[PDB]
């Protein structure tokens, strides 16, 4: 019988939940018959991300329909699908790559999971990360919360954010590998939202970049790693629904740097000298005249306010860094939404 506490024990169920592995393929709309779970592989993926990598190539280098119908003849082929709709397009392409990009993941927890002691702590040293419940009437708790009421955006009223449980969290590595940056200026304490699904991923591996097969053009800033300083521009992709109304959201030190502001969509393999992050400028930005510190960090608690910025792609902010050394995992926050 496990040792763990209850609401971490709870944390690593979610996280290795075999059901909604399954769930999230079939909304993606993946053939679980011709492709169930047990035959999703890393290079299976890898390679339809590089047909993809193709696909935008011959669509901006003119190329016959035949071409590109066979090229996306072969992603079908790869990644059997029940639904055929023809990748011919940049809107058809990043359907795909974020489907791949949860593929990814899906796959990163069912190797680690097929692959004594009671299961449960069994699971929890496969993710090689220490957690720890953050006591609720600590000052951790007091920021953490004040954080979340406040930069939740106007527009994503379609549900209220209930905070159920605080984690602390440290990837085994995480601070060495951070050591480089532990030095630089501009951090900030920034939320990162993804299914539930990609969680054993994204805490036994961390936060990566795209495979190299993944084309530039298939993220708006390219392939680096994203936050948001909007609550709920990062819970959204939580894609919580009412079968599941809770959903996971990271907090992570940020290493921005001189910030490269930009309005509108640019596929950045790297930085120009003198950069270090993207700042994608939103229209609403909160506060700067209520941000706090929380040890070493600043965050980005304050109410959200116009930017003055009109001539923009993006309702609210965002931030890209290209090298994972400059993310540091911090916070793992279990949620409730509340729709409308
Ligand atoms: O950070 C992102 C990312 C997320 C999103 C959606 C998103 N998800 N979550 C957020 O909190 C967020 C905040 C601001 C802007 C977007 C987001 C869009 C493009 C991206 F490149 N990654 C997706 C691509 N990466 C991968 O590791 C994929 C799985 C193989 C690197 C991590």
């Known amino acids: ?41 890393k290079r299976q993926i890898q390679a339809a991300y590089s047909i993809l990598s193709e696909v935008q190539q011959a669509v901006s280098q003119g190329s016959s329909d035949s071409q590109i119908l066979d ?33 990814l993941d899906i796959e990163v927890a069912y190797s680690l999971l097929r692959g004594s002691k009671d299961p449960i702590d069994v699971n929890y040293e496969k993710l090689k990360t220490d957690i720890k419940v953050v006591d609720r009437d600590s000052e951790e708790a007091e920021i953490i919360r004040k954080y979340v009421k406040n930069t939740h955006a106007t527009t994503h009223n379609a549900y209220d954010l209930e905070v159920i449980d605080i984690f602390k969290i440290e990837r085994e590595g995480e601070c060495q590998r951070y050591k480089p940056f532990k030095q630089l200026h501009n951090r900030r ?19 990566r970049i795209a495979p190299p097969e993944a084309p530039v053009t298939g993220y708006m800033f390219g392939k680096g790693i994203y936050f948001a300083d909007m609550v709920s521009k990062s819970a959204n992709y939580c894609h919580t629904s009412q079968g599941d109304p809770i959903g996971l959201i990271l907090l992570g030190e940020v290493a921005l740097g001189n910030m490269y502001e930009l309005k509108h969509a640019s596929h950045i393999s790297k930085l120009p000298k003198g950069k270090h992050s993207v700042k994608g400028l939103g229209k609403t930005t909160p506060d700067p005249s209520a ?21 923009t792609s993006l309702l609210y902010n965002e931030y890209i860094v290209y090298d994972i050394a400059q993310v540091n995992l911090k916070y793992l926050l279990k949620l409730k939404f509340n729709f409308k």
């Not at 090229?71 to 790869?78: G, K, M």
């Not at 055929?84 to 359907?95: C, F, H, I």
């Open 291 to 311: 941000n706090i510190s929380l040890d070493g960090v600043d965050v980005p608690l304050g109410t959200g306010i116009s930017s003055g910025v009109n001539d």
């Open 189 to 207: 304490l920034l939320w990162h939202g993804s299914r539930t699904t990609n969680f054993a991923g994204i805490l036994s591996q961390g936060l």
């Open 71 to 103: 090229l996306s003849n072969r992603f079908y082929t790869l990644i059997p699908h029940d639904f055929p709709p023809l990748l011919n397009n940049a809107d058809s392409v990043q359907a795909k790559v974020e489907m791949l990009d949860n593929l």
């Open 1 to 41: 019988k496990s040792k763990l506490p209850k609401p971490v024990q709870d944390l690593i169920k979610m996280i290795f939940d075999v059901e909604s592995m399954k769930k999230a393929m079939v909304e993606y709309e993946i053939d679980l018959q011709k492709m169930p779970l047990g035959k999703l592989s």
